[PDB]
UniProtKB/Swiss-Prot annotation, chain B:
Full protein name: Volume-regulated anion channel subunit LRRC8C
Residues of the full protein shown: 16 to 394 of 803
Subunit structure: Heterohexamer; oligomerizes with other LRRC8 proteins (LRRC8A, LRRC8B, LRRC8D and/or LRRC8E) to form a heterohexamer. Homoheptamer; inactive, likely because it is not targeted to the plasma membrane in the absence of LRRC8A. In vivo, the subunit composition may depend primarily on expression levels, and heterooligomeric channels containing various proportions of the different LRRC8 proteins may coexist.
Domain note: The volume-regulated anion channel (VRAC) channel forms a trimer of dimers, with symmetry mismatch between the pore-forming domain and the cytosolic LRR repeats, a topology similar to gap junction proteins.
Transmembrane segments: 8-33, 75-94, 138-159, 190-214
Disulfide-bonded cysteines: C39-C183, C65-C168
Residue intervals annotated with topology Extracellular: 160-189
Induction / repression: Induced during the earliest stages of adipogenesis.
Phenotypic consequence of L55R: No effect on channel activity of the complex with LRRC8A
Family under the similarity heading: Belongs to the LRRC8 family.
Tissues expressing the protein: Expressed at very low levels in adipose tissue.
Swiss-Prot record, chain C:
Endpoints of the signal sequence: none
UniProt modification remark: N-glycosylated.
Keyword annotations from UniProtKB, A to Z: Acetylation, Cell membrane, Differentiation, Disulfide bond, Glycoprotein, Ion channel, Ion transport, Leucine-rich repeat, Lysosome, Membrane, Phosphoprotein, Repeat, Spermatogenesis, Transmembrane, Transmembrane helix, Transport
Organism: Mus musculus
Name the record gives this protein: Volume-regulated anion channel subunit LRRC8A
Length: 732, 254, 718
């Protein structure tokens, strides 16, 4: 059947030689069982019990019937014919049969038979694997920049790809099961040694006893009571033929022994418990081809003896590079374009998003959706951007999450002209691609993860000076000093963000060289104080200093330097008092001072008439100064989680109050002037100590239940018409 | 339903039975063709000892002495071996010539192949209600052990009965003129070694049966969960190949 | 199996001759085993161990019992009968067995059996390939599956040729087999002819046994002897044939020198020039197959050739790109032209030459595309894009392109990716070279063939050129548009740009000049200047712009310009002025001396007031102050009745003036991003206004009366 490839040439030779040796055994047996006789004549003159060997001549009358001749023939043949001459064919038959049993011990034995049949089936199906020949047909600034050579892609069918995957799985399972065994090799060694020793024994004892087969014999059987003669001389007719057969048999056995000795010598010299495997991969440059252990190097050597090519067709199937390539191809054929379009989402910035989280690799089917805008790749190991990314015309932002991403020359060419934003989240410095600094159109760059280093800190990012068109920068690395590269490159940056998330940062007067800056966010930098140099940024418009453990903000009196300071965020601190000096800040339009310990609202604060957003929640505030009418531009006020229990009338003097957050307070009652808030859209009241809601609330032009945050119990107090109109606005 | 059902000891028994049948056929052929007894009257430079007997008289003496004097075991050893080997082979193959086991094992092989490709609920109902197949196999092995013991025990004595020389005191007088004859059985010394080889084969057969006894009576294969029939039919394939049990246990799991 | 094609006629004849020889060997063997004997009678009168041959006739009495005759027969047969008369059939059987071993040695020897089965499996599928018959007929339309199978078989043939040509084992085994057959035939013929006459019916034996029979010599008959002689003769004759044939094969194996296969006859007749000579160990199998039959060699020649593979690839590609889908993907660019964009293909499809309406061809990342003469099928084509592909061209194609091409786009990742032949064209007028060709000590040498492009009028450079190339100055004697983009790299001229007198447009984008070079002011023919994103901070050099008498447009946007010098008021000719994306907070009044100004974009600046002089410009058609701090529209800003564009987004305007309705040429205005209380109804009276032209929030757009909104929706509909 399929086991023809198991047998080397020396095994086929022994098979045929055993067939011939058994054929001559059968011939000898069938010749002897029928035609083997002895022809005896007695000797009349006997001296010392031997044939004395002592007018035309005449015959010699022995006076014997033919039956007496038959009797003496039988007796003499039974007694004085050498046992080897009488049993040579049976000995030959037995030796041939045991030779054949040795040659087929490891096949009829089901234990190793299972291993051999599994191996031959797997090797056969891998030899005819369609993807194997295709994989074979696949056949210094650039290396250190993170740029790799071109990768060649084709197209594959679904069913044959699944067949290749299943074949890979079967190969993995088989190598797991068989590599440990080292059983078939031991049985093969036992069989070879048994054959060698049996050949030695027979080649000895035969050539010892072959001289016994002689044409003529002398037998002294001592039966005179039946015949009257003592000694007979007899002839063995087949003796010469048996001698010829014995010589031919020992010549065949000598050939068999030579072949077995060659097999033993080869197996001992090779040391084939681990296959070398180096030449094939060294020629093919497939480095994921380890040397296999016992019970699998022996089979490799056998199949190599049958045909070397059969090793190569398996070698590519034992490589991890081939596994990666086939898996990547089945992945490319896996994600349907419809599945991708269903997986397309919309982000907060009205852009199309494809978030690839923990996949095998980048599917090249996603490069067909030309409408993609933002690309997020989370936890894909060491991927490389193919040139096909040039098809994504609408791509603007690239997000990398712990991916040591590489790129190719055409893909880098495209991203040199079509990339605007780059987000990097790296746990290790090596994960940062080094080809990013050649992107001459990159405007927004984000870096997340500890880049902190000793004696080389802020040196790996010195390529930031090359991104001339860089505008945005956000850093989340628990740093303590401003990088020199960022200090130099900030001259053209419009926004710089740092999130030390605990580490105390020192500006070291390195911030005031970035005069073009407009936004500056420093969250959880543990500043404990506003450094002076910030005021030297004359173009700043907003500033957030959240969670810096601030106790005094009296320094904001310097903010008169900024003629375009639009907003100032100081939430999430220990702020207990708002200094009156903020009255100098006439340009303030928004302000945030929540999560603090503020108890009162200073009256001078109401000198900032341009305020439109005020959020001072989570404070000890307990009253509202009457000067709220001064701030006619206010649209959103939050007093959530405060001690507010009264409302001055001037609260309702702001007719453009768009929304309010007045819940989670201790407000006992609401003044009836609520209807004055003609621009009220959303309101919050949950948590207040109210009893009855005002009817004048129900006349608000923009009031809706979704914009009505209040307990349903207190909401029940409203007129039924108010509830009905609220529900109608909910439905409409 | 052919290969997976044969444990290694079963294959050894099959090969030994084939060899024994070959030996029996060879012995029968020799008995048919070349089996004869040569006889001479006992007692009437050297001369002849003319007994003045015709060829026909010699042949008559030969046939009389061969039919009477020669031991029955010498005359019927080949057919005895033939019958014993036929009984062994028939007993072994009767387990599958029987239609009921042919219905059981066919379904077992179908379900095993289906479980290897990647009914079991009905299988554990209709098949686990048995255990008579395990008992049948045990009884067949016990019968084979009985046959081996009986054969060896009674044959080791009668093997020495066959002798080259032999004597017959037959009332052939007044037809030939003699009463006592010395004869030889020409192939007796070959039959001795033939029977010795047959005894060795039967001894190895019995040792294989004894090891099958160890396999059958060491770990109470009635339980393994599955009933006795299913446990036995699982142990069989496990012995043939240790792997198929892992791929069959999957569908039983819920 | 299919081994009958690997057996020539002579091997079949030897196979049958060996069967007949084995038959007579078995016949002789069974005769000698069963019925061979001698019949011996003693001679009474012996003279020198020889029979002397010296009332009616009477029988001669020898006084010997039958068993004595048996003994003398056995002894005389053993001793005096010639061994060649007893062992003839066994020798015949042995010789036949070794002959059969020689004939079938390479088939059982696995090392060559693998190669033989490999070749005979490949040849069968190569014989019955569906593509083969059509290729023979062609000296069309096919399935995708059959083309894929043909390509796979081409791969298999390549690998098989590489695997087999190297070996040289089958031929050695065949040579050794035939040598052994011939020499053994010589031996057996020699010795058998020598000994065949030693088979005599009657033999005389002096066996020297008188103590048992009393006689010295015997005369005997060998009954089978005559028959054996016949077989012996009937044997040697067969061997003679079995000799001659083998000899012929030896000569046939030593006459043609079959290690090499010429193959030239079929490639000559069927015109397949890519059919190479095959080296050892592979020509032999083809020779044997041809000896069986020549058709299989023909069916293998097509797959062995190379032009056939290219033709199959082309046919598969053309079948895949049907005209229907090719037209479906063929769309129009934004420049109002019909362009073809083939991206990352194996090569140039042959169906794309199916059109005459093509004028733009875009080939990107398509390796080794050879420009056929068939590109002549489209004569009006004038634009061609070659991105990341150096295409090989032909003489007819080059001649066609030397007169009928106008735009060539060359985006190259490497210096070698620029084809040289593009320098030979004479009628080219639009050129684009993208790729960093800047190199150390070989600067601007890849562009040496630019001189011959005399007809050129447009030249664009995005090649990271640190300095101004000299060939650019050479080609600037007749240019009409020069675009230079260094991707932010600092560009240095130093008196190398003023020599292009004939230039009409200049664009130095992201050249990082940081300061205007004076050479530009020398270009009196220059009309429109673009210096986008060069970090300009002081632009007082515009006072020299009076030397440009046709300067109507200036582009100095995306820079760091702090203040606009009032001297720009001297440039009265300007209609479009672009200075947005800068650091400008105040607008000088003198700038409004240019009443011809039509496009004024100053978005993304620090503006807070709009001067009253902004209305002095009647030709003001476009206004863009998006992302600024403007508070209110000055009344004079409504003097320009033809203000056809208005960009007011991201501004802090509190109220919208009612004079906007006085503008009836208003075609588009964007109001999104402004803090406006409500929409004045005057905006609704503009005849040219539409809903799509207006940009404003719906919740405030509804504040207009329902009549105005309905009229706007109707005007938007049609």
């Amino acid at each position: 059947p399929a086991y023809r490839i198991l047998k080397p040439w020396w095994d086929v030779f022994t098979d045929y030689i055993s067939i011939v040796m058994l054929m001559i055994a059968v011939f000898g047996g069938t010749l002897q069982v029928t035609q083997d006789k002895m022809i005896c004549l007695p000797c009349k003159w006997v001296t010392k019990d031997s044939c004395n060997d002592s007018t035309g001549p005449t015959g010699i009358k022995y006076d014997l019937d033919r039956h007496q001749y038959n009797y003496v023939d039988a007796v003499c043949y039974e007694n004085r014919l050498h046992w080897f001459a009488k049993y040579f064919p049976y000995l030959v038959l037995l030796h041939t049969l045991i030779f054949l049993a040795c040659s087929n011990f490891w096949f009829k034995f089901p234990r190793t038979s299972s291993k051999l049949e599994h191996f031959v089936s797997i090797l056969l199906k891998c030899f005819d694997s369609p993807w194997t020949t295709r994989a074979l047909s696949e056949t210094k600034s650039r290396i250190e920049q993170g740029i790799v050579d071109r990768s060649e892609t084709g197209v594959l069918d679904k069913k044959e790809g699944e067949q290749a995957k299943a074949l890979f799985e079967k190969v993995k399972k088989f190598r797991t099961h068989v590599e440990e065994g080292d059983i078939v090799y031991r049985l093969y060694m036992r069989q070879t040694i048994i054959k060698v020793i049996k050949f030695a024994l027979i080649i000895c004892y035969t050539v010892y006893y072959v001289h016994n087969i002689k044409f003529d014999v002398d037998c002294t059987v001592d039966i005179e009571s039946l015949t009257g003669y003592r000694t007979y001389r007899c002839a063995h007719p087949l003796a010469t033929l048996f001698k010829i057969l014995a010589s031919f048999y020992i010549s065949l056995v000598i050939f068999y022994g030579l072949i077995c000795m060659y097999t033993l010598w080869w197996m001992l010299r090779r040391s084939l418990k681990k296959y070398s495997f180096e030449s094939i991969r060294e020629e093919s440059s497939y480095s994921d081809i380890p040397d296999v252990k016992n019970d699998f190097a022996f089979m490799l050597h056998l199949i190599d003896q049958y045909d070397p090519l059969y090793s190569k067709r398996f070698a590519v199937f034992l490589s991890e590079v081939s596994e990666n390539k086939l898996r990547q191809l089945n992945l490319n054929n896996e994600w349907t374009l419809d599945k991708l379009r269903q997986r397309l989402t919309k982000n907060a910035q009205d852009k199309l998003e494809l978030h690839l989280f923990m996949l095998s690799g980048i599917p090249d089917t996603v490069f067909d959706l030309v409408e993609l805008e933002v690309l997020k790749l989370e936890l894909i190991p060491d991927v490389t951007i193919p040139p096909s990314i040039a098809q994504l015309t609408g791509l603007k932002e690239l997000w990398l999450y712990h991916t040591a991403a590489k790129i190719e020359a055409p893909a880098l060419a495209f991203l040199r002209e079509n990339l605007r934003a780059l987000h990097i989240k790296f746990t290790d410095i090596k994960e940062i691609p080094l080809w990013i600094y050649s992107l001459k159109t990159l405007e927004e760059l984000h870096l997340t993860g500890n880049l902190s280093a000793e004696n080389n800190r802020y040196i790996v990012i010195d390529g930031l000076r090359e991104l001339k068109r860089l505008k945005v920068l956000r850093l989340k690395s628990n740093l303590s000093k401003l990088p020199q590269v960022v200090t130099d490159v900030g001259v053209h940056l419009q926004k710089l963000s740092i999130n030390n998330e605990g580490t105390k940062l020192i500006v070291l007067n390195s911030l005031k060289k970035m005069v073009n800056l407009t936004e500056l966010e420093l969250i959880r930098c543990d500043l404990e104080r506003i450094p002076h140099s910030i005021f030297s940024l004359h173009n700043l418009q907003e500033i957030d200093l959240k969670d810096n453990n601030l106790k005094t903000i009296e320094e904001i009196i310097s903010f008169q330097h900024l003629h375009r300071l639009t907003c100032l965020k100081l939430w999430y601190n220990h702020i207990a008092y708002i200094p009156i000096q903020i009255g100098n800040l006439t340009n303030l339009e928004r302000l945030y001072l929540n999560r603090n310990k503020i108890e009162k609202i200073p009256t001078q604060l109401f000198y900032c008439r341009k305020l439109r957003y005020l959020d001072l929640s989570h404070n000890n505030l307990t009253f509202l100064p009457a000067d709220i009418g001064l701030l006619q531009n206010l649209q959103n006020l939050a007093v959530t989680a405060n001690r507010i229990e009264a409302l001055p009338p001037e609260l309702f003097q702001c007719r453009k109050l768009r929304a309010l957050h007045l819940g989670n307070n201790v407000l006992q009652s609401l003044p009836s002037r609520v209807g004055e808030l003609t621009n009220l859209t959303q309101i919050e009241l949950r948590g207040n100590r109210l009893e009855c809601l005002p009817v004048e609330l129900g006349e608000c032009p923009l009031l809706k239940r979704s914009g009505l945050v209040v307990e349903e119990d207190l909401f029940s107090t409203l007129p039924p018409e108010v509830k009905e109109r609220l529900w109608r606005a909910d439905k409409e | 339903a052919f290969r997976v059902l044969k444990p290694w000891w079963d294959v050894f028994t099959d090969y030994l039975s084939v060899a024994m049948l070959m030996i029996g056929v060879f012995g029968c052929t020799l008995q048919v063709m070349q089996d004869k007894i040569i006889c001479l009257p006992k007692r009437v430079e050297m001369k002849g000892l003319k007994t003045d007997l015709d060829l026909q008289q010699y042949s008559f003496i030969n046939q009389m002495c061969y039919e009477r004097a020669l031991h029955w075991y010498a005359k019927y050893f080949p057919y005895l071996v033939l019958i014993h080997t036929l009984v062994f082979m028939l007993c072994s193959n009767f387990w599958f010539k029987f239609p009921g086991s042919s219905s059981k094992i066919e379904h077992f092989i179908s379900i095993l192949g289906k479980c290897f490709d990647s009914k079991v609920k009905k299988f554990r109902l209709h098949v686990e209600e048995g255990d008579i197949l395990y008992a049948m196999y045990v009884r067949q092995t016990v019968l084979k052990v009985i046959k081996f013991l009986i054969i060896i025990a009674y044959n080791s004595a009668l093997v020495s009965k066959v002798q080259f020389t032999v004597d017959c005191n037959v009332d052939i007088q007044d037809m030939t003129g003699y009463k006592n004859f010395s004869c030889n059985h020409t192939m007796a010394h070959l039959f001795s070694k033939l029977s010795f080889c047959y005894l060795c084969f039967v001894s190895i057969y019995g040792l294989t049966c004894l090891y099958t006894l160890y396999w059958l009576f060491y770990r109470s294969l009635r339980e393994y969960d599955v009933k006795n029939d299913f446990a036995f039919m699982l142990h069989m394939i496990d012995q043939y190949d240790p792997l198929y049990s892992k791929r069959f246990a999957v569908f039983l799991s819920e």
